[PDB]
Design a protein around this ligand. Structure first.
Ligand SMILES: Nc1ncnc2c1ncn2[C@@H]1O[C@H](COP(=O)(O)OP(=O)(O)OP(O)(O)=S)[C@@H](O)[C@H]1O
Ligand SMILES: Nc1ncnc2c1ncn2[C@@H]1O[C@H](COP(=O)(O)OP(=O)(O)OP(O)(O)=S)[C@@H](O)[C@H]1O
Lengths: 350, 146, 53
């Protein structure tokens, strides 16, 4: 006479909880409190709260169906521990409808953002609230680097069947090696935002990490995601295990991985094999083109001032980094003349 | 300037996060100035010790991402360095790095710090809180003997 | 008057679960949900689900 369902620790779990929370026909017999700080921009800041439903029996009149819901935790909980949700009714033709509406609520939040996933044991999870996309034009790189990388990535993503027809693993890996503050990770963020993919950052120096855990993580990544290995030169994981995971029998399929270093010389030949690192790019220090385009980005319209600024930078004869230029422009916010005056500050480093 | 210019960072695609460094000899007023600035802004200091062995990279990232609002991060003696160098670097300036946070670092041995940590993106402002100077001596005397 | 059988953690276990799942005469009184992403080749991608018993 009635039908039921269970779910715990799942993508739809939080989506479901959010959908229950917003719904106006909630008859929540048990409540909780979630305190949060509300920021009225720079005008003022105050603290407020929201009475999230608590654990127990709750009724909802979902468009003509009296649905009962039950939230309960395990014997204990903040290390991970299972929490399950149940839902009760005779007819299930509204069940999938509620689940789809929860999906829609989830999609609304992750509209103009890029989700970040982190390694926690053999599976991933979202880390913090999503962040806004770093649009590619903001990332100033040397001429042709951005365009070449984008063309390579689009060619790889589009040519899916072509790999299979010729018996190659449909997996590609990119390397961005260069000095610090050269825009590497910024470009990773921007490319992920452009493709609408989600970055799955992974730290191999993590001691609790193991080869089996590594293989499971790289095989159970969420779809439409990019793997990121910041400072792959850092190297419980084993060298052979890593090599096999990147390119080997246990290696996954339909994945894109990005690696970054400041010391590419440390990396051996096997890791730099084309099968593992197909594309390698030198994200070097700032060049006059990069300096000019950064100046236009921070001081748009100021052309002659740009010309004098780049001439002065050239005359200084310094290996200025891009981040140094960003810091200088941030000091002299909306003050191109002040930036021109302080241009000499880039020479000093300590 | 940093606190007021919030939207300006976003419009130009920069992380709204800044880091300050106060390097100098001991007993130069570094941590005292940190306390005073936090009091002036009415912020709450969130002191963090990286030399703590039980600390981990994931724990570090969660802590720097779940800080209470209206707070200042403080890393006393950042030159001390289970945390990893790469993990710390990514946490300060990286994909997992948080937003709308101000961090203050102090050292007596800035030479130990490498170039990557001293990158402008991570340490935007660096100040030498040196030994006493005649101006400082005079003003201290007026403070204690007005 | 009736007979029974047990199995756990075995090659036939997952095979059995899949056979129960596909069967149309299922009268499953308890359900679950398995969310998965459906890829319409390069044309588009969307997310869907399956109510596993
Ligand atoms: N090419 C660039 N385009 C835009 N912003 C840049 C660029 N290079 C540096 N920046 C700025 O300076 C910061 C430092 O550069 P990042 O890309 O974050 O670090 P990176 O040294 O390039 O690579 P890693 O992985 O952090 S060592 C960035 O977050 C930007 O704010
Ligand atoms: N510039 C200063 N202004 C005011 N009081 C100061 C100053 N320098 C030192 N003092 C006093 O001497 C103490 C020692 O200085 P601190 O600021 O506490 O330590 P510091 O050596 O400056 O930095 P750390 O982080 O403690 S190594 C302070 O607590 C004050 O009582």
């Amino acid at each position: 006479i009635v039908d039921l369902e269970i779910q715990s620790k799942d993508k739809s779990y939080a989506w479901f909880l959010t959908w229950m929370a917003k719904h106006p026909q909630r008859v929540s017999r048990h409540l909780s409190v979630r305190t949060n700080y509300i920021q009225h921009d720079n005008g003022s800041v105050s603290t407020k709260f929201s009475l999230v439903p608590g654990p127990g029996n709750h009724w909802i009149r979902y468009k003509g169906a009296f649905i009962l819901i039950k939230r309960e935790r395990s014997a204990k909980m903040s290390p991970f521990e299972t929490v399950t949700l149940t839902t009760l009714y005779r007819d299930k033709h509204l069940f999938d409808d509620i689940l789809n509406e929860a999906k829609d609520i989830a999609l609304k939040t992750t509209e103009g953002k890029t989700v970040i996933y982190t390694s926690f044991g053999p599976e991933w999870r979202k880390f913090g609230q999503p962040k806004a996309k770093r649009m590619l034009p903001s990332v100033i790189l040397d001429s042709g680097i951005k365009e070449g990388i984008l063309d390579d990535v689009y060619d790889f993503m589009k040519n899916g069947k072509w790999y299979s027809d010729r018996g190659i693993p449909y997996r590609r890996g990119y390397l961005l090696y260069g000095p610090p503050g050269s825009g590497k990770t910024s470009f990773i963020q921007a490319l992920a935002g452009e493709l609408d993919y989600n970055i799955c950052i992974l730290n191999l120096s993590e001691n609790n990490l193991t080869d089996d855990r590594l293989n499971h993580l790289m095989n159970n990544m969420p779809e439409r995601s990019i793997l990121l290995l910041e400072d792959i030169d850092a190297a419980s994981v084993t060298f052979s295990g890593l090599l096999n995971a990147l390119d080997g029998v246990t290696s996954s399929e339909e994945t894109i991985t990005f690696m970054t270093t400041n010391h590419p010389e440390k990396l051996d030949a096997a890791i730099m094999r084309p099968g593992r690192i197909d594309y390698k790019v030198f994200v070097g220090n700032a060049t006059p083109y990069q300096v000019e385009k950064m100046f236009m980005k921070f001081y748009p319209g100021e052309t002659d001032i740009c010309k004098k600024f780049v001439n002065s930078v050239k005359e200084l004869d310094i290996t200025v980094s891009t981040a140094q230029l960003q810091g200088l422009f941030v000091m002299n916010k909306d003050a191109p003349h002040d930036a021109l005056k302080m241009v000499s500050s880039l020479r000093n480093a300590n």
